[PDB]
């Protein structure tokens, strides 16, 4: 394989959404030591050219704004090369499935329409080619292998995996806020807001540093979902430092881990910007599903 | 005198901030202004809709504060215990000082009183009548509510009376910082005026020069030096960006919510391509004060600035 296909309402225009998302993808790969040659957005998708597609994919699953990810092989769009590459990918996957006669299907999509054959014809010819070289059978309902094919600007992208991303919005597309971090709950609140496209500056309040080591541990976990932001924990010894942080970095909101009025009234007055409580405002079922996927 | 009365807030005006934050931000800018100009002062506080600056250099403080946005009017004043006796004698003392400056045998005057808090026994009109009678009995003068050479102002708040004869008009607008932060592309007099107009609307502006260390930069630094005298509350440092990538970096790093340009209708084509292009090159909204704000208003600003 040589690339990773990245598939993705926002207050950002389409072009800025893509530029910010590509920025975050770039920062994630650099931070996690995954090599890549290029990153570009064309015809609604982002292509990351890299010789470490599997490693890249694993990382990109944590980048908000991404719906699905597909490690893949990019080849010249010719029936000959598409057939050979599709068979090569099928055999690698078949080896992993471990069945003598795996069920499969082919799914092709012409992003751009210059290729002379339509999706149906591509799927039929590729299926016939595979059927002539491996013991297997076509099954459109239940299959062990799915050969996906996307053709765009004279290139064919062939894959067998469609990894689900976290969805949400790209970090930085919905502004910048500070997140008051002190426990697992406040940490979850920060995660839920980053998924909403908010760049968060985590802050630990207080001179007393007994709970600081524990907090740094929490941030180290959250950091893996913060690509695009500086991701530096700010320790504020007193409140004047928090207000200064808000002013100096153009913060537009404050996130707290309050869970389900008095504190809310007091919060409203002590902060010069709106305070958000994700654990209270968002649907319980949604939060539940997020916790479940995070294994909490 | 021993204080400066700072008045703010005006009907029909909208501030995204609550009154409390509006006042804290304004006091912050007032402190920055006085400290920058090295004007001594003892205290600065906000009470009952007014900001009081306790200082033995009231005239000097007042002249600096004229350049602080969000201020409607400024009055150097004498603070005294709120007793009719003290109010009368201080009012006469200040009236005489002003009358000497006016230089007329029989100046026209009026008294304007306000009970900010309501503990004083006499209402505003009673105070005006009594103080006016005191002055009329001790000086050759005449009451005239429409045209007057002298106005004796009296504000009573929490047992203290603030007496003044001067009421300096501020620039109005909103305190710098109450309406967010934006970068202002500075390159000429027009863009400088554009920035001035936005700061007046309470926007903290980071001036940015897109270019190299040339002669136009020297010209820009001098433009910024003039604008700086109206930017108390912001960092107020000119940023030189060698390329557009540095501008985007600045926007991201400082959490800028908008970009200000000095574009005029006279610089656009029927397709306003520069506007549509601007919309695409910047990740945040771009504002054009010289196009969006009324013509007569802009002229008034230029007139007051002597441009």
XYZ file of C-alpha atoms in Angstrom:
603
model
C 0.000 0.000 0.000
C 1.093 3.594 -0.541
C -1.713 5.912 0.605
C -4.508 6.434 3.110
C -7.899 7.701 1.949
C -9.497 10.056 4.488
C -13.255 10.595 4.193
C -15.193 13.334 5.968
C -22.687 20.796 10.353
C -19.707 23.164 10.439
C -19.653 26.959 10.652
C -16.515 26.751 8.506
C -16.586 26.874 4.704
C -15.703 23.630 2.938
C -12.231 24.836 1.953
C -11.291 25.942 5.473
C -12.703 22.739 6.971
C -10.356 20.788 4.683
C -7.324 23.013 5.299
C -7.743 22.796 9.084
C -8.317 19.040 8.929
C -5.187 18.552 6.788
C -3.255 20.668 9.307
C -4.445 18.409 12.134
C -3.643 15.255 10.174
C -0.146 16.622 9.550
C 0.370 17.416 13.236
C -0.937 14.003 14.313
C 1.444 12.123 12.005
C 4.440 14.262 12.980
C 3.632 13.942 16.706
C 3.193 10.169 16.493
C 6.284 9.675 14.316
C 4.451 8.406 11.229
C 6.145 9.273 7.920
C 4.290 10.633 4.893
C 5.184 12.255 1.565
C 2.119 14.383 0.765
C -1.288 15.370 2.086
C -3.884 16.864 -0.241
C -7.627 17.285 -0.597
C -9.273 16.487 -3.912
C -12.872 15.901 -4.945
C -14.230 15.679 -1.424
C -11.565 13.444 0.102
C -8.087 13.746 1.545
C -5.229 11.571 0.377
C -2.190 10.950 2.553
C 0.662 9.436 0.534
C 2.739 7.314 2.897
C 4.651 4.044 3.067
C 3.284 3.429 6.569
C -0.467 3.463 5.767
C -1.503 1.057 8.527
C 0.346 3.088 11.168
C -1.059 6.303 9.689
C -4.585 4.892 9.775
C -4.278 3.871 13.423
C -3.347 7.458 14.292
C -5.943 9.203 12.119
C -8.767 7.343 13.850
C -8.204 9.822 16.707
C -8.446 12.927 14.494
C -11.870 14.547 14.814
C -13.701 15.425 11.625
C -12.934 12.092 9.970
C -15.775 9.698 9.144
C -13.767 6.793 7.704
C -10.196 5.833 6.828
C -8.892 3.444 4.184
C -5.253 2.328 3.887
C -4.831 1.686 0.154
C -2.738 1.151 -2.945
C -2.725 3.904 -5.550
C -2.140 2.811 -9.148
C -2.576 4.121 -12.688
C -6.246 3.723 -13.592
C -6.149 0.945 -16.200
C -8.262 -2.216 -16.054
C -5.044 -4.265 -16.127
C -3.467 -2.585 -13.088
C -6.775 -2.418 -11.240
C -7.290 -6.164 -11.702
C -3.763 -7.080 -10.610
C -3.802 -4.743 -7.588
C -7.292 -5.851 -6.572
C -6.128 -9.490 -6.642
C -2.996 -8.646 -4.652
C -5.039 -6.851 -1.971
C -7.627 -9.649 -1.959
C -4.925 -12.259 -1.333
C -3.404 -10.308 1.571
C -6.814 -9.974 3.227
C -7.756 -13.587 2.427
C -4.582 -14.703 4.185
C -5.765 -12.839 7.289
C -9.350 -14.136 7.068
C -8.035 -17.693 7.005
C -10.797 -19.448 5.076
C -10.359 -21.705 2.052
C -13.324 -20.119 0.237
C -13.963 -16.554 1.476
C -17.125 -14.698 0.447
C -16.518 -11.316 -1.187
C -17.833 -8.451 -3.270
C -16.390 -5.500 -5.169
C -17.500 -1.890 -4.682
C -16.265 0.705 -7.153
C -16.852 4.431 -7.346
C -15.792 6.831 -10.065
C -15.174 10.074 -8.181
C -14.301 11.699 -11.510
C -15.733 10.170 -14.699
C -12.827 9.895 -17.137
C -12.471 6.110 -16.768
C -14.227 4.388 -19.749
C -16.014 1.727 -17.670
C -18.756 2.424 -15.127
C -18.842 1.090 -11.558
C -20.962 -1.946 -12.433
C -18.584 -3.020 -15.210
C -15.530 -2.423 -13.030
C -17.031 -4.532 -10.239
C -17.967 -7.350 -12.627
C -14.588 -7.503 -14.366
C -12.647 -7.333 -11.106
C -14.895 -9.984 -9.585
C -14.385 -12.262 -12.597
C -10.619 -11.734 -12.415
C -10.492 -12.688 -8.732
C -12.836 -15.648 -9.297
C -10.407 -16.967 -11.945
C -7.434 -16.899 -9.552
C -8.793 -17.825 -6.116
C -11.240 -20.222 -4.527
C -13.951 -17.844 -3.354
C -17.512 -16.749 -4.057
C -19.473 -13.555 -4.530
C -21.915 -12.668 -1.746
C -23.475 -9.205 -1.700
C -25.069 -9.595 1.744
C -22.468 -11.269 3.957
C -18.833 -11.178 2.903
C -15.446 -11.734 4.520
C -13.782 -9.421 2.025
C -14.812 -6.230 0.286
C -12.609 -4.898 -2.477
C -13.214 -1.164 -2.534
C -12.153 0.878 -5.538
C -12.170 4.652 -5.953
C -11.102 6.213 -9.251
C -10.135 9.875 -9.302
C -8.193 11.884 -11.887
C -6.646 8.905 -13.643
C -5.748 7.109 -10.417
C -7.322 4.045 -8.834
C -7.284 3.617 -5.044
C -7.757 0.004 -3.964
C -8.470 -1.067 -0.383
C -10.035 -3.809 1.742
C -10.495 -1.803 4.946
C -12.852 1.003 5.917
C -11.902 2.023 9.463
C -14.481 4.103 11.326
C -13.251 7.465 12.592
C -14.646 9.427 15.529
C -16.567 11.851 13.362
C -17.179 15.232 14.953
C -15.577 18.432 13.653
C -11.877 19.246 13.057
C -10.150 20.803 16.057
C -9.890 24.541 15.598
C -12.918 24.945 13.322
C -15.139 26.095 16.186
C -12.767 28.397 18.062
C -10.607 28.193 21.173
C -11.590 27.635 24.819
C -9.849 26.740 28.060
C -10.799 23.565 29.875
C -10.586 23.442 33.655
C -8.994 20.032 34.217
C -8.924 18.330 37.622
C -10.522 14.872 37.317
C -11.795 12.149 34.990
C -15.139 13.943 34.563
C -13.660 17.301 33.554
C -11.371 15.360 31.229
C -14.363 13.771 29.508
C -15.973 17.208 29.217
C -12.879 18.447 27.402
C -12.918 15.452 25.049
C -16.561 16.078 24.128
C -15.785 19.701 23.256
C -12.712 18.914 21.142
C -14.940 16.519 19.175
C -17.196 19.540 18.639
C -14.262 21.164 16.845
C -13.058 23.296 19.751
C -9.336 23.802 20.344
C -8.859 23.444 24.098
C -6.140 24.841 26.327
C -6.178 22.665 29.484
C -5.696 24.492 32.778
C -4.888 23.239 36.272
C -5.833 25.785 38.927
C -4.082 26.253 42.242
C -0.781 26.522 44.081
C -1.368 23.220 45.884
C 0.255 20.626 43.619
C -0.768 17.309 45.202
C -3.212 16.523 42.399
C -0.960 17.881 39.629
C 0.804 14.623 38.783
C -2.587 12.911 38.474
C -3.828 15.737 36.263
C -0.784 15.534 33.976
C -1.603 11.835 33.583
C -5.162 12.687 32.536
C -3.911 15.242 30.030
C -1.435 12.731 28.603
C -4.432 10.586 27.648
C -6.458 13.521 26.282
C -3.427 14.712 24.314
C -3.848 11.741 21.944
C -7.087 13.338 20.707
C -5.883 16.945 20.567
C -3.859 17.132 17.324
C -3.961 20.673 15.987
C -3.688 22.420 19.352
C -0.526 23.276 21.297
C -1.578 20.685 23.863
C 0.338 22.229 26.770
C -1.070 22.027 30.299
C -1.195 25.461 31.922
C -0.774 25.585 35.685
C -2.449 28.694 37.094
C -1.407 29.510 40.672
C -4.253 32.015 41.074
C -7.323 33.241 39.178
C -5.649 36.384 37.849
C -3.460 34.021 35.800
C -6.534 32.343 34.310
C -8.044 35.688 33.235
C -4.679 36.685 31.736
C -4.604 33.404 29.802
C -8.096 34.077 28.443
C -7.072 37.565 27.295
C -3.638 36.664 25.915
C -4.859 33.781 23.785
C -8.223 35.117 22.625
C -10.208 32.417 24.427
C -13.959 32.560 23.772
C -15.220 30.068 26.329
C -14.481 28.017 29.429
C -15.281 24.303 29.815
C -16.005 22.706 33.196
C -16.842 19.147 34.236
C -19.939 19.977 36.274
C -22.514 17.173 36.134
C -26.275 17.083 36.869
C -27.430 26.375 39.436
C -25.625 28.163 42.264
C -22.186 27.309 40.930
C -23.484 28.134 37.452
C -24.528 31.623 38.576
C -21.163 32.143 40.259
C -19.344 30.774 37.194
C -21.241 33.210 34.975
C -19.979 36.189 36.963
C -16.387 35.109 37.565
C -15.579 34.472 33.887
C -15.519 37.157 31.129
C -16.670 34.600 28.541
C -19.398 31.897 28.465
C -18.903 28.745 30.543
C -19.936 25.397 29.028
C -20.985 22.201 30.799
C -20.948 19.310 28.246
C -21.888 16.686 30.838
C -25.092 18.625 31.525
C -26.024 20.050 28.115
C -25.393 16.996 25.934
C -27.723 13.938 25.763
C -27.038 11.249 28.373
C -27.240 8.509 25.737
C -24.701 10.273 23.542
C -22.271 10.662 26.446
C -22.890 6.994 27.273
C -21.957 5.885 23.761
C -18.811 8.026 23.870
C -17.740 6.513 27.185
C -18.393 3.018 25.828
C -16.227 3.550 22.751
C -13.499 4.994 24.991
C -13.814 1.974 27.259
C -14.643 4.048 30.324
C -9.739 69.369 43.010
C -8.977 65.781 43.988
C -10.781 63.366 41.633
C -11.903 62.755 38.067
C -15.463 61.590 37.393
C -15.658 59.210 34.442
C -19.119 58.674 32.943
C -20.067 55.890 30.548
C -22.957 53.931 29.113
C -25.595 55.389 26.823
C -29.186 54.510 25.943
C -29.543 52.537 22.739
C -25.962 51.299 23.013
C -25.246 47.585 22.904
C -22.349 45.826 24.604
C -21.918 42.067 24.401
C -20.457 42.318 27.917
C -22.348 42.552 31.199
C -22.135 45.893 33.006
C -19.659 44.430 35.508
C -17.159 43.258 32.890
C -17.658 46.452 30.896
C -16.585 48.426 33.977
C -13.623 46.192 34.866
C -12.248 46.378 31.325
C -12.725 50.156 31.220
C -10.937 50.622 34.561
C -8.130 48.423 33.228
C -7.711 50.662 30.190
C -7.870 53.790 32.363
C -5.091 52.432 34.593
C -2.964 51.566 31.554
C -3.446 55.067 30.140
C -2.496 56.918 33.327
C 0.494 54.663 34.027
C 1.730 54.961 30.437
C 1.487 58.767 30.580
C 2.951 58.768 34.098
C -0.062 60.498 35.642
C -0.130 59.893 39.422
C -3.348 58.597 41.008
C -4.320 57.076 44.358
C -7.281 54.874 43.426
C -9.603 53.877 40.591
C -12.993 52.331 41.343
C -16.484 51.907 39.907
C -19.571 52.649 41.990
C -23.204 53.224 41.061
C -22.569 53.562 37.334
C -19.637 55.949 37.685
C -15.882 55.487 37.753
C -13.942 57.691 40.132
C -10.217 58.281 39.778
C -8.773 59.677 43.012
C -5.786 61.815 42.002
C -4.027 65.080 42.819
C -3.401 65.600 39.086
C -7.076 65.636 37.932
C -6.650 68.052 35.025
C -3.762 65.993 33.645
C -5.627 62.716 34.143
C -8.753 64.078 32.462
C -6.790 65.151 29.382
C -5.348 61.645 28.981
C -8.661 59.879 29.602
C -10.235 61.761 26.698
C -8.421 59.205 24.521
C -9.961 56.170 26.243
C -12.850 54.654 24.277
C -16.055 53.839 26.123
C -15.983 57.105 28.064
C -18.883 59.479 27.409
C -17.647 62.385 29.541
C -14.959 63.350 32.038
C -15.120 65.836 34.934
C -12.177 66.888 37.126
C -13.855 67.546 40.481
C -13.596 68.320 44.183
C -14.830 65.619 46.552
C -16.277 66.755 49.885
C -18.555 65.481 52.649
C -22.151 65.746 51.443
C -23.554 68.494 53.683
C -25.397 71.523 52.309
C -22.854 73.821 53.977
C -19.872 72.114 52.329
C -21.626 71.754 48.968
C -22.474 75.485 48.969
C -19.008 76.719 49.852
C -17.234 74.372 47.431
C -19.697 75.267 44.676
C -19.025 78.995 45.219
C -15.263 78.415 45.348
C -15.298 76.595 42.021
C -17.737 79.078 40.508
C -15.385 81.934 41.343
C -12.405 80.124 39.856
C -14.303 79.544 36.620
C -15.794 83.050 36.601
C -12.300 84.529 36.768
C -11.367 82.496 33.685
C -14.593 83.466 31.887
C -13.826 87.126 32.592
C -17.300 88.658 32.513
C -18.894 91.077 34.971
C -22.132 89.100 35.077
C -21.714 85.523 33.789
C -24.755 83.365 33.020
C -24.897 80.054 34.909
C -26.926 77.038 35.981
C -26.544 74.298 38.563
C -26.936 70.655 37.596
C -27.340 68.175 40.432
C -27.762 64.418 40.544
C -28.351 62.171 43.540
C -26.617 59.033 42.412
C -27.530 57.404 45.715
C -30.620 58.742 47.530
C -29.566 59.381 51.135
C -29.141 63.172 50.830
C -32.285 64.951 52.200
C -32.785 67.343 49.259
C -33.667 66.176 45.755
C -31.715 67.283 42.686
C -33.951 70.258 41.919
C -33.888 71.390 45.556
C -30.084 71.211 45.523
C -29.943 73.211 42.285
C -32.251 75.893 43.705
C -30.419 76.221 47.030
C -26.924 76.247 45.525
C -28.014 78.695 42.846
C -29.456 80.993 45.519
C -26.170 80.820 47.426
C -24.159 81.815 44.353
C -26.641 84.576 43.416
C -26.289 86.061 46.920
C -22.489 86.193 46.696
C -21.706 87.006 43.061
C -22.941 89.252 40.281
C -24.400 86.681 37.925
C -27.593 85.440 36.327
C -29.339 82.102 35.952
C -29.792 80.920 32.362
C -30.655 77.271 31.724
C -30.227 77.486 27.941
C -27.106 79.572 27.369
C -24.621 79.686 30.223
C -20.951 80.582 30.632
C -20.705 78.396 33.727
C -22.264 75.136 34.842
C -21.875 74.026 38.450
C -22.271 70.252 38.450
C -22.961 68.293 41.623
C -23.062 64.519 41.992
C -23.865 62.975 45.365
C -22.960 59.372 46.059
C -22.682 57.498 49.353
C -22.243 60.550 51.581
C -19.787 62.307 49.267
C -20.453 65.251 46.955
C -18.439 65.671 43.748
C -18.454 69.257 42.522
C -17.247 70.332 39.092
C -17.341 73.140 36.512
C -15.785 71.194 33.616
C -17.379 68.396 31.587
C -15.104 67.121 28.816
C -16.694 65.127 26.008
C -15.123 61.704 25.548
C -15.030 59.713 22.315
C -17.888 57.468 23.316
C -17.704 54.058 21.677
C -16.893 50.921 23.675
C -13.915 49.997 25.893
C -11.065 48.331 23.990
C -11.315 44.609 24.657
C -15.059 44.366 25.302
C -15.748 43.332 21.709
C -12.976 40.844 20.977
C -9.635 40.875 19.185
C -8.809 41.378 15.502
C -5.718 42.063 13.424
C -5.615 45.274 11.439
C -3.716 45.366 8.167
C -1.890 48.693 8.394
C -0.231 50.232 5.327
C -1.503 53.805 4.925
C -3.565 56.621 6.458
C -6.864 55.072 5.342
C -6.125 51.693 6.917
C -5.011 53.556 10.052
C -8.391 55.306 10.234
C -10.084 51.951 9.672
C -8.240 50.595 12.716
C -9.097 53.669 14.773
C -12.805 53.217 13.992
C -12.760 49.560 15.062
C -10.918 50.222 18.324
C -13.652 52.784 19.048
C -16.153 49.931 18.693
C -14.357 48.153 21.536
C -12.119 45.943 19.409
C -8.601 45.173 20.590
C -6.498 45.492 17.450
C -3.122 43.942 16.692
C -1.603 46.089 13.926
C 0.082 44.076 11.185
C 2.419 45.305 8.476
C 2.711 42.926 5.529
C 6.026 43.768 3.922
C 9.763 44.167 4.412
C 12.054 46.567 6.274
C 11.584 49.359 3.721
C 10.759 53.071 3.761
C 7.025 52.442 3.781
C 7.569 50.548 7.031
C 9.113 53.646 8.587
C 5.995 55.445 7.369
C 3.807 52.748 8.917
C 5.587 52.841 12.275
C 4.826 56.566 12.446
C 1.173 55.835 11.665
C 1.071 53.299 14.480
C 2.690 55.780 16.889
C -0.319 58.064 16.450
C -2.803 55.191 16.841
C -1.030 53.941 19.958
C -2.239 57.020 21.873
C -5.755 55.581 21.535
C -5.003 51.903 22.176
C -4.710 51.622 25.960
C -5.741 48.118 26.979
C -4.110 46.275 24.087
C -0.504 45.145 23.641
C -0.136 47.884 21.047
C 2.877 46.516 19.169
C 3.276 46.586 15.397
C 3.739 43.115 13.924
C 5.736 42.786 10.710
C 4.802 39.722 8.645
C 7.262 38.793 5.893
C 4.681 36.559 4.175
C 1.017 35.540 4.426
C 1.803 32.340 6.324
C 2.969 34.501 9.244
C -0.369 36.355 9.231
C -2.332 33.095 9.464
C 0.003 31.974 12.253
C -0.708 35.215 14.136
C -4.453 34.745 13.739
C -4.214 31.191 15.096
C -1.753 31.898 17.928
C -3.617 34.915 19.314
C -7.188 33.731 18.796
C -8.033 36.597 16.431
C -11.738 36.722 15.505
C -11.506 39.136 12.598
C -9.387 41.073 10.122
C -9.654 44.809 9.431
C -8.696 46.437 6.113
C -8.803 50.040 4.907
C -10.616 49.192 1.672
C -12.880 51.876 0.178
C -15.740 51.560 -2.352
C -13.442 53.480 -4.704
C -10.979 50.563 -4.728
C -13.474 47.899 -5.796
C -14.786 46.657 -9.136
C -18.421 45.690 -9.778
C -17.633 42.124 -8.699
C -15.882 43.244 -5.501
C -13.361 40.515 -6.265
C -11.127 41.773 -3.467
C -13.998 41.161 -1.044
C -14.718 37.646 -2.334
C -10.981 36.896 -2.489
C -10.582 38.225 1.076
C -13.377 35.936 2.165
C -11.348 32.994 0.871
C -7.833 33.891 2.024
C -8.761 34.544 5.674
C -10.184 31.902 8.092
C -12.072 34.637 9.958
C -14.408 37.463 8.810
C -12.854 40.535 7.205
C -14.261 43.964 8.034
C -14.169 47.163 5.992
C -15.055 50.114 8.278
C -14.661 52.703 5.511
C -17.292 50.890 3.449
C -19.664 49.609 6.147
C -19.853 52.714 8.352
C -21.951 55.803 7.375
C -20.374 58.645 5.396
C -21.433 61.504 7.694
C -20.187 59.564 10.716
C -16.748 58.956 9.234
C -16.500 62.652 8.357
C -17.326 63.612 11.949
C -14.532 61.366 13.227
C -12.047 62.775 10.727
C -13.161 66.288 11.673
C -12.595 65.714 15.382
C -9.171 64.207 14.679
C -8.294 67.151 12.443
C -7.766 65.014 9.344
